[PDB]
Every structure is written in C-alpha cells, then in structure tokens.
mmCIF file of C-alpha atoms and ligand atoms in Angstrom:
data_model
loop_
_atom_site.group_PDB
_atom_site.id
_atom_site.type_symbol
_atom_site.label_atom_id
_atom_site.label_comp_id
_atom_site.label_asym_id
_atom_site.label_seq_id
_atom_site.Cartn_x
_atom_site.Cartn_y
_atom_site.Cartn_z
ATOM 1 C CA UNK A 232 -8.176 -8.484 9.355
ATOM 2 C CA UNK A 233 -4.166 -8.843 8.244
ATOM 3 C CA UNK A 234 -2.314 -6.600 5.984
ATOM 4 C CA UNK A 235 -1.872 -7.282 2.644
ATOM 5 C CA UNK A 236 1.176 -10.057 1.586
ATOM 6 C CA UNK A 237 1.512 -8.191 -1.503
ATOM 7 C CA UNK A 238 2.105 -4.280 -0.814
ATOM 8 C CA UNK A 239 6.511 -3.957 -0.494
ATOM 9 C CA UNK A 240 6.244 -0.066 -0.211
ATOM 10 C CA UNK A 241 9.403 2.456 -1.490
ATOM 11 C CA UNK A 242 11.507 -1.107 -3.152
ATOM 12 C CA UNK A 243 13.732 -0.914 -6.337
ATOM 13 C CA UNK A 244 12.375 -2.473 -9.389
ATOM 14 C CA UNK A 245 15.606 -4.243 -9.544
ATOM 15 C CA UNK A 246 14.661 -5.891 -6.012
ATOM 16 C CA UNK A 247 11.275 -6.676 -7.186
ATOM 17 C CA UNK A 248 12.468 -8.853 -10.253
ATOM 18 C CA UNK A 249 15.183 -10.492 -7.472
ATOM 19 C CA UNK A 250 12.461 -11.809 -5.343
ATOM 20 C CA UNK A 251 9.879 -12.499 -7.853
ATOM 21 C CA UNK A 252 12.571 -14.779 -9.630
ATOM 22 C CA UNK A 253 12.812 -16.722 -6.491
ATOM 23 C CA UNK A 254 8.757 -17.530 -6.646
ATOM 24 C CA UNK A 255 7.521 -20.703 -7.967
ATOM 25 C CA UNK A 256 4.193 -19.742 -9.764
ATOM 26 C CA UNK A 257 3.700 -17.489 -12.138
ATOM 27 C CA UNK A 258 1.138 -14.459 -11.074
ATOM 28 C CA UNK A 259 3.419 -14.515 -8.014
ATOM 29 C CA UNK A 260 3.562 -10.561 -7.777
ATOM 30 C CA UNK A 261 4.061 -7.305 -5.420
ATOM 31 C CA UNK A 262 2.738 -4.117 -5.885
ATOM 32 C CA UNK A 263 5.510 -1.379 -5.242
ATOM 33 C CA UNK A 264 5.825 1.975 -5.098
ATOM 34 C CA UNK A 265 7.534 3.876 -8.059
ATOM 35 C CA UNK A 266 11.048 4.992 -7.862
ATOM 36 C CA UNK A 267 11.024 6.575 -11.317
ATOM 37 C CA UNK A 268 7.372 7.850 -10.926
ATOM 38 C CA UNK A 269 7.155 9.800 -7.361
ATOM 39 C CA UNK A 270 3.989 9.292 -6.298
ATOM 40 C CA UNK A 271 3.110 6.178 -8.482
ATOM 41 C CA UNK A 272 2.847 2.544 -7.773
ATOM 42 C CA UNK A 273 4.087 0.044 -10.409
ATOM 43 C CA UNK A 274 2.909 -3.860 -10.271
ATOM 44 C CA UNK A 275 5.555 -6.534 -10.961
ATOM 45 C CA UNK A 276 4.533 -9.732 -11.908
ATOM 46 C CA UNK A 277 6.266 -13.345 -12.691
ATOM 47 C CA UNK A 278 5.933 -15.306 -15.858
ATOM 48 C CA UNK A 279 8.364 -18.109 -16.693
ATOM 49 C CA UNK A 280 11.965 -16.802 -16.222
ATOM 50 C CA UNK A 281 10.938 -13.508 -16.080
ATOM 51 C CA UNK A 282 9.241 -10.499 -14.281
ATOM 52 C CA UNK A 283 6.793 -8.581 -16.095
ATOM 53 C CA UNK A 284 6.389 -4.728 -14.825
ATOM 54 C CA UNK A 285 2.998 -2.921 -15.150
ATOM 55 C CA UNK A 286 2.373 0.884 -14.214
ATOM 56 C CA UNK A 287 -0.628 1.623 -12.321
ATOM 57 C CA UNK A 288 -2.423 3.954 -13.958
ATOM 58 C CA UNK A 289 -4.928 6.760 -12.785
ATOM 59 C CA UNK A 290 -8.007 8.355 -14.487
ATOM 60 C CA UNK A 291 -9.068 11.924 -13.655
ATOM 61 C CA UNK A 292 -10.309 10.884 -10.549
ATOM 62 C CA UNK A 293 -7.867 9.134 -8.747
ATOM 63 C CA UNK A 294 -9.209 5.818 -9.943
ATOM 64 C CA UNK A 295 -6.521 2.696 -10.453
ATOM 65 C CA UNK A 296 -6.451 0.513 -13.340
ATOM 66 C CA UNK A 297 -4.148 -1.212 -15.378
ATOM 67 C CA UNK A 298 -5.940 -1.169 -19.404
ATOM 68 C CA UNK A 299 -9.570 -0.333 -19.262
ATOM 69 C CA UNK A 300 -11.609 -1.725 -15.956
ATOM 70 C CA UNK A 301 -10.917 0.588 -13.136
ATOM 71 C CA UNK A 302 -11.218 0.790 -9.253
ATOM 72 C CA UNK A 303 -11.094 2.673 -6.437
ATOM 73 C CA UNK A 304 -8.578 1.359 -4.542
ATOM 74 C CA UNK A 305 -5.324 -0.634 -5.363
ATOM 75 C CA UNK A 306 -6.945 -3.693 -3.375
ATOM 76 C CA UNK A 307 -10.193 -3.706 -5.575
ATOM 77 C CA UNK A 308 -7.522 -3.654 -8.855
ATOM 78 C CA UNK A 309 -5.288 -6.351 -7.161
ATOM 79 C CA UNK A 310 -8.369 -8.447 -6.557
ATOM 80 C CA UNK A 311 -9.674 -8.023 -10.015
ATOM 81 C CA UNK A 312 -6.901 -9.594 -11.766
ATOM 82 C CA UNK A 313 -6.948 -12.730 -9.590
ATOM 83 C CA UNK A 314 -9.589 -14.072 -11.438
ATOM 84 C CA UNK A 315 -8.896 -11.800 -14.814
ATOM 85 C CA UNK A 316 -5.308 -11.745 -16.792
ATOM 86 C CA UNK A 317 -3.463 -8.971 -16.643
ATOM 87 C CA UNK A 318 -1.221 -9.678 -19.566
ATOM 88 C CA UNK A 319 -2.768 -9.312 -23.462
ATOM 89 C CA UNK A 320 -0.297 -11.976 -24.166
ATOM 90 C CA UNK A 321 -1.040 -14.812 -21.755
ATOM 91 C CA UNK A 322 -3.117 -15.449 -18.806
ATOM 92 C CA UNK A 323 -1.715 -14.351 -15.956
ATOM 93 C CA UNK A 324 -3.439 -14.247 -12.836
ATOM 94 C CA UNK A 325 -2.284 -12.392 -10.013
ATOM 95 C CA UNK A 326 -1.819 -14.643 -6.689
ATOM 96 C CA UNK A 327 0.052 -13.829 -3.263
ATOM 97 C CA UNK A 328 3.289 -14.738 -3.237
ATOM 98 C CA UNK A 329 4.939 -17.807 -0.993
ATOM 99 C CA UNK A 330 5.577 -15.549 1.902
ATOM 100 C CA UNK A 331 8.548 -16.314 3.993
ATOM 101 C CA UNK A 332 7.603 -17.852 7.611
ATOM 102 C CA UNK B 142 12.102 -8.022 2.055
ATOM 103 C CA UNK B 143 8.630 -8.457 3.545
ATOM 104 C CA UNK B 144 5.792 -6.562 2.679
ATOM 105 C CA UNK B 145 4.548 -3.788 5.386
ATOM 106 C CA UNK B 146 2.811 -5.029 8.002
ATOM 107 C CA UNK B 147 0.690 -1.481 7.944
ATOM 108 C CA UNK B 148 -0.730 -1.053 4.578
ATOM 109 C CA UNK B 149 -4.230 -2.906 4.917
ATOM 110 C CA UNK B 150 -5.729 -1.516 1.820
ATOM 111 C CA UNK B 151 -10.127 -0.809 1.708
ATOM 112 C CA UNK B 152 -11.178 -1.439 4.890
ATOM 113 C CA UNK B 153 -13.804 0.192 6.461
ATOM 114 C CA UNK B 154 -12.375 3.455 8.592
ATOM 115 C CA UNK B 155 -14.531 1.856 11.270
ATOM 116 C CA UNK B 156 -13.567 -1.623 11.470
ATOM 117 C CA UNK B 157 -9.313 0.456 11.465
ATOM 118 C CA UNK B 158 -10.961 1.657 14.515
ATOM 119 C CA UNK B 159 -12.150 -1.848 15.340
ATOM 120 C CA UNK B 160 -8.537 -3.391 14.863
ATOM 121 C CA UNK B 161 -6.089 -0.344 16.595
ATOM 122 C CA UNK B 162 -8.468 0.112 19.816
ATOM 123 C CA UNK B 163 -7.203 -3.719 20.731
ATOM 124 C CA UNK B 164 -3.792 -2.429 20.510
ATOM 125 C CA UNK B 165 -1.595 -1.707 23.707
ATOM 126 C CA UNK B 166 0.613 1.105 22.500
ATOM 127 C CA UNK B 167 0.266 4.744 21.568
ATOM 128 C CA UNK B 168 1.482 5.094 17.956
ATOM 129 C CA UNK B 169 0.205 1.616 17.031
ATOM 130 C CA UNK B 170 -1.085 2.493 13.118
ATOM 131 C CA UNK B 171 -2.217 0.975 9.767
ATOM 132 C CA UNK B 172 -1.989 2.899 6.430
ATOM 133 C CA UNK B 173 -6.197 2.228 4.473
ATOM 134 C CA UNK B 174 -7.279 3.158 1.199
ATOM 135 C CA UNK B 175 -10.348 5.526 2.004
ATOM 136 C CA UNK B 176 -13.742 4.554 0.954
ATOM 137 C CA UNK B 177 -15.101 8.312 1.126
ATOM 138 C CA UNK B 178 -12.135 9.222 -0.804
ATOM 139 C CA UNK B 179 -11.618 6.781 -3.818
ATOM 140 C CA UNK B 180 -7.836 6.932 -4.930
ATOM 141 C CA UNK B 181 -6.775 8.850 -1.424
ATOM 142 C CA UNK B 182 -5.229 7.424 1.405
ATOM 143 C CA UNK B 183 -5.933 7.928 5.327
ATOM 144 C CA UNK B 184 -3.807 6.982 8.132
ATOM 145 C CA UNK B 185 -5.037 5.517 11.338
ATOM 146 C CA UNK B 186 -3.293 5.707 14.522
ATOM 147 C CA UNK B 187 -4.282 5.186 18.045
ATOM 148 C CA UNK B 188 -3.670 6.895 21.004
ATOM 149 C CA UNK B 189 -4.990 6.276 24.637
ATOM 150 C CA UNK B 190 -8.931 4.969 24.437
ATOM 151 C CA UNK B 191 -9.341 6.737 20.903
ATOM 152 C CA UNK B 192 -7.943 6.238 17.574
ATOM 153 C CA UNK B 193 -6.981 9.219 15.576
ATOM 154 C CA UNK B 194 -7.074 9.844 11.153
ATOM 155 C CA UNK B 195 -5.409 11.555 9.052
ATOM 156 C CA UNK B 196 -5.858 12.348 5.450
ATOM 157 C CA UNK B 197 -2.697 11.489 3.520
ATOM 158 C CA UNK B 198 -2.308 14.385 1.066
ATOM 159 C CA UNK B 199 -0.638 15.193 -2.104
ATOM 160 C CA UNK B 200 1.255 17.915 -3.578
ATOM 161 C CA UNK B 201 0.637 19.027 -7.125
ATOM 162 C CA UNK B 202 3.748 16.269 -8.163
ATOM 163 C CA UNK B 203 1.827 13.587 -6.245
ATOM 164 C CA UNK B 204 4.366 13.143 -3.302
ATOM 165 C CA UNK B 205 2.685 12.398 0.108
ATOM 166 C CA UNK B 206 2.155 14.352 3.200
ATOM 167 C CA UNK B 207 0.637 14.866 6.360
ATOM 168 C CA UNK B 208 1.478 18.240 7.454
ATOM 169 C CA UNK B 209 4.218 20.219 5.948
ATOM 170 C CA UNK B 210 7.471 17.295 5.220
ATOM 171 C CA UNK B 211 6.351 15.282 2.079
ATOM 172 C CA UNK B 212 7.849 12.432 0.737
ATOM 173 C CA UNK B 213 8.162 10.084 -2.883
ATOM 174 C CA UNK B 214 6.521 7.593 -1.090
ATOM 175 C CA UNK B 215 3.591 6.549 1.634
ATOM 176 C CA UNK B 216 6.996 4.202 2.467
ATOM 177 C CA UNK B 217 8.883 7.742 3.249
ATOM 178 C CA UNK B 218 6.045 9.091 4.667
ATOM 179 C CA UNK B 219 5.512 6.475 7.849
ATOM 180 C CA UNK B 220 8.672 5.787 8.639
ATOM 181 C CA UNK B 221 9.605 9.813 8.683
ATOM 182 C CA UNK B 222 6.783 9.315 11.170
ATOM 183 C CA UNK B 223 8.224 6.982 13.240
ATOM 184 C CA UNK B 224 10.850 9.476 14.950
ATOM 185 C CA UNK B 225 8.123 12.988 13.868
ATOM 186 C CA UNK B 226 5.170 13.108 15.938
ATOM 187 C CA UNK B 227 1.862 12.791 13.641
ATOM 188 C CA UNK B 228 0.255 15.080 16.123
ATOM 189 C CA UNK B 229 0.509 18.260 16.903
ATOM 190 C CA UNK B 230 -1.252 17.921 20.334
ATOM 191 C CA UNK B 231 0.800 15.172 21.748
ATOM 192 C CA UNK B 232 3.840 13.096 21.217
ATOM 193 C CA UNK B 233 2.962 10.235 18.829
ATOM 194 C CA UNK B 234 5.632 8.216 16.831
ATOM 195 C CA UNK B 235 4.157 5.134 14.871
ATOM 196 C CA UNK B 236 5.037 1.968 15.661
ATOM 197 C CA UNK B 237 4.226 -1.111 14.162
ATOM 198 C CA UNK B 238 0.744 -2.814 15.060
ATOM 199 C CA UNK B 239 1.577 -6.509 17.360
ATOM 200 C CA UNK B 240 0.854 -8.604 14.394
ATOM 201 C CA UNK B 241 -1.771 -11.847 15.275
ATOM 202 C CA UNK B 242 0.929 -14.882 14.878
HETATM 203 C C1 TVN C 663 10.674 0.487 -17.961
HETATM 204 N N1 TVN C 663 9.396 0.418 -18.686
HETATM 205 C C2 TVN C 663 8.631 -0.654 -18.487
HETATM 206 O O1 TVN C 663 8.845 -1.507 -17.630
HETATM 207 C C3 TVN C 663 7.434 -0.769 -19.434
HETATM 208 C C4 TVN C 663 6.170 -1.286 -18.737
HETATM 209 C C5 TVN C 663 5.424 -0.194 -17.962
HETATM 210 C C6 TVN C 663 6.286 0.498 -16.901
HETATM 211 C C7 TVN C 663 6.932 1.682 -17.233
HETATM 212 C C8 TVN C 663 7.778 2.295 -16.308
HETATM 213 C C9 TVN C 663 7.986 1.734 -15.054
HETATM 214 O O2 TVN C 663 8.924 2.337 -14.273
HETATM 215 P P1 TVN C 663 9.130 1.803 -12.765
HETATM 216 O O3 TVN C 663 7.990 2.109 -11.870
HETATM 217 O O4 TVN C 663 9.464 0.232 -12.842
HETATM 218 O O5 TVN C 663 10.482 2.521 -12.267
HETATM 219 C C10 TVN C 663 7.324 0.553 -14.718
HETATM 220 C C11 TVN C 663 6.477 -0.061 -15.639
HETATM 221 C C12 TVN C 663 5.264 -1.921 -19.795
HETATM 222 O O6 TVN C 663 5.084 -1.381 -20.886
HETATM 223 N N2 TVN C 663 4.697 -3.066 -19.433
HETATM 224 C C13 TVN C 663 3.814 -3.852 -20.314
HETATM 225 C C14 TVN C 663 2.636 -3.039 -20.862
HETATM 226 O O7 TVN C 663 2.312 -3.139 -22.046
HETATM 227 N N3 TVN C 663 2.021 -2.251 -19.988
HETATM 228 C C15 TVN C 663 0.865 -1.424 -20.367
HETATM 229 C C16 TVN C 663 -0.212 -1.497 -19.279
HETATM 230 C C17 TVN C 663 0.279 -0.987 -17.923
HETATM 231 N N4 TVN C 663 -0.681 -0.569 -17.104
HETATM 232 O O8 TVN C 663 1.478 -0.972 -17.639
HETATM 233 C C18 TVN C 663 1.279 0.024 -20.640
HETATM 234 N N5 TVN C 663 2.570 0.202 -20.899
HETATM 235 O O9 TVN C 663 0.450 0.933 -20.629
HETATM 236 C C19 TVN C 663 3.311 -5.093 -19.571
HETATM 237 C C20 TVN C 663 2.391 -5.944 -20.451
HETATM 238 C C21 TVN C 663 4.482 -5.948 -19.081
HETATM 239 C C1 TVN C 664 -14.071 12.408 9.209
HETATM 240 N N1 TVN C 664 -13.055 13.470 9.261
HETATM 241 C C2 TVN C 664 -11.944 13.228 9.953
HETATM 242 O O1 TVN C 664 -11.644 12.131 10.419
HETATM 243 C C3 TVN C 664 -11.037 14.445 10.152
HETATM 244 C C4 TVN C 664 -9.547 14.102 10.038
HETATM 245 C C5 TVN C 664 -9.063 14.008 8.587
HETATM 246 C C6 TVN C 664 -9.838 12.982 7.752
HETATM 247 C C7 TVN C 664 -10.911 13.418 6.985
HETATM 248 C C8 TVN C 664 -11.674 12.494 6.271
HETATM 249 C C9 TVN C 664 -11.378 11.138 6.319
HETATM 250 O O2 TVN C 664 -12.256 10.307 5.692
HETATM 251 P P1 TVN C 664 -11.906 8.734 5.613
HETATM 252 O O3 TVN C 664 -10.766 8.427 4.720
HETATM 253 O O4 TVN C 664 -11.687 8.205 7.116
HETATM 254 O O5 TVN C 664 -13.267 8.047 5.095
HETATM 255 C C10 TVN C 664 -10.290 10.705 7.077
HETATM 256 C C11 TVN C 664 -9.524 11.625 7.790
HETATM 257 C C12 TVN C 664 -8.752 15.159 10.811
HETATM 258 O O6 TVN C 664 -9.029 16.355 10.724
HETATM 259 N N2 TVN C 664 -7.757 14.681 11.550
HETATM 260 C C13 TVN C 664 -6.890 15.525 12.391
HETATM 261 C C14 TVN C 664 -6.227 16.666 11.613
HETATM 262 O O7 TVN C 664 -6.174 17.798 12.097
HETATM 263 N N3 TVN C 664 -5.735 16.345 10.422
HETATM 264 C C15 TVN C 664 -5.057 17.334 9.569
HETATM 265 C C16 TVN C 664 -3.798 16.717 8.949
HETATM 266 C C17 TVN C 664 -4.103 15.501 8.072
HETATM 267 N N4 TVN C 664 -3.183 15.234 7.151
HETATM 268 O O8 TVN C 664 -5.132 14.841 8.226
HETATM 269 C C18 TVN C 664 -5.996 17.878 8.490
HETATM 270 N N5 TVN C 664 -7.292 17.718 8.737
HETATM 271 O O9 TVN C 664 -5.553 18.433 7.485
HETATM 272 C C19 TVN C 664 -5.831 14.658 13.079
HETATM 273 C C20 TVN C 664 -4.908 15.494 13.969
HETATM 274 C C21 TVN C 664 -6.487 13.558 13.916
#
C-alpha cells in the first residue's frame, strides 16, 4: 500500500488552482483541506482553462459526499467519481494527477 | 507541493499495522480513515515491536485533536506532532514513513 497522490493537506485554494493549471487532463484534481471552512475539506478539480472548486459535504453522520451518493470515507467519494462526473455541467471524471518524479 | 506521504485513506487498521511494523524508526506514522468509525479519522504510529492508535477527535467547530492542542487542520495536527510527543508514556515525535521508491 502507498499514500494517496491526491490528498495536499492545509494548501490555499489559490495554490490549488496554480498547480491544477499546470495539469494536462482535465479531472486532474487534489482534495485539500479548507482554509475558509476549519475542519472541512474542499475538492478542486481541472476543466479546460480552469479549476473548478467543490465543498465536501457531510450528512448527520459524518458521511462525505458531494450532491446526493454518499460515503464513508473521502477515498470511497474520490473513487466514486472516477468512473461518475462530478460536474452537472460536463463529465468530469476525477483522475490522479501527473505527479512530479 | 506534493501531496502527504501519510494520509493513506480506508485501509484496514490492521493491514496500518501490517505496513508501520516494517518500519525502522519510532514515530514512523500514517494518518487512515477508520472503518469502525465512518467520517472519523485514526492515527497510527509505531513504536518499538508494537504500533500504537489514536482516535483523531473533534471539537464542537470541527478542528482536530489528539489530546488537549487542536488545530484547523489534520495538516496542523501532524506536523504540531512532529516536535509534541503523541504519547504520554514515552517520547514519540512523528516522522515520515521511508517511502517504497
Ligand atoms: C468560493 N465558493 C465556491 O468556490 C463555490 C463552490 C463551492 C465552494 C464553496 C466554498 C469553498 O471555500 P474554500 O474551501 O475553497 O475556501 C470551496 C468551494 C461551488 O459552488 N462549486 C460548484 C457547485 O455547484 N458545487 C455544489 C456541490 C458541492 N459539493 O460543492 C454546491 N455548491 O453545493 C461546482 C459545480 C464547481
Ligand atoms: C481499539 N481501540 C483502540 O485502539 C484504543 C485507542 C483509540 C482508538 C479507538 C478506536 C479506534 O478504532 P479504529 O479507527 O482503529 O477502527 C482507533 C483508536 C487508544 O485508546 N489509544 C491510546 C489513547 O490513550 N488514546 C487517547 C487519545 C486519542 N486521541 O486517541 C484516547 N483514547 O482518547 C493511545 C495512547 C495509543
């Protein structure tokens, strides 16, 4: 087992949309954790020539999800969007980005 | 900016066992999404032939703690750890895990 490519930890949303600019692919993305929202992680994604932001959301039990399907861990929801959109506007799948060797 | 080499996300909290007993150093550690918890996160760190966990808890704001300090972020939290002992019975300061090249 390796850690996950995708989790950045405590990183400004303004650094998140500097890297993700830099990806290739879109779905290139980075979970992060909330500057604004203490406690809260936030999901930035790239699309085009620009980074889409997402908030994680929680239901009353401490589940994650970003509209309706939920999980129990930020890895199950990170997973789930590989292989579903996580835009209502295009489809945008979630894949690691190019990490740097 | 890299991602963390300690968040590994669901794993089992046996198979963190699995992974930190094959590490050299005291403080060696890896940040899991709990499986018994849904939503909470545990902390696994080893020390000597055994490998120690530790519920990451919340205050009522959501900020993250292990004892009494609490921080925005799980980022705060582990590197406030790195120079604070997570134990209270002996002298542990995470360090990162030898990542497999
Ligand atoms: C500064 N405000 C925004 O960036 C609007 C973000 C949601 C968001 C709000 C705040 C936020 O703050 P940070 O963590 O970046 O500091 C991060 C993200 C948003 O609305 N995103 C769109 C959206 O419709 N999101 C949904 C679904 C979701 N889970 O975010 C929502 N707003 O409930 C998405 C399709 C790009
Ligand atoms: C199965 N139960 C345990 O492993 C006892 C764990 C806390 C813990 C409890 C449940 C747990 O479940 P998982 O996420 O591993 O599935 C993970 C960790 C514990 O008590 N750890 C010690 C401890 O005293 N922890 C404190 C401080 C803390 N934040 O965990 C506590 N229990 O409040 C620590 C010094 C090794």
């Amino acid at each position: 087992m390796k850690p996950h490519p995708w989790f950045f930890g405590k990183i400004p949303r303004a650094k998140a949309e500097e890297m993700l600019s830099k990806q290739r692919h879109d779905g290139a993305f980075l979970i992060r954790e909330s500057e604004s929202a203490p406690g809260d992680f936030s999901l930035s994604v790239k699309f085009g020539n620009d980074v889409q932001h997402f908030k994680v959301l929680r239901d009353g039990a401490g589940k994650y999800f970003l509209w309706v399907v939920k999980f129990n861990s930020l890895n199950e929801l990170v997973d789930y969007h590989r292989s579903t959109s996580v835009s209502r506007n295009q489809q945008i799948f979630l894949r690691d980005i190019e990490q740097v060797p």
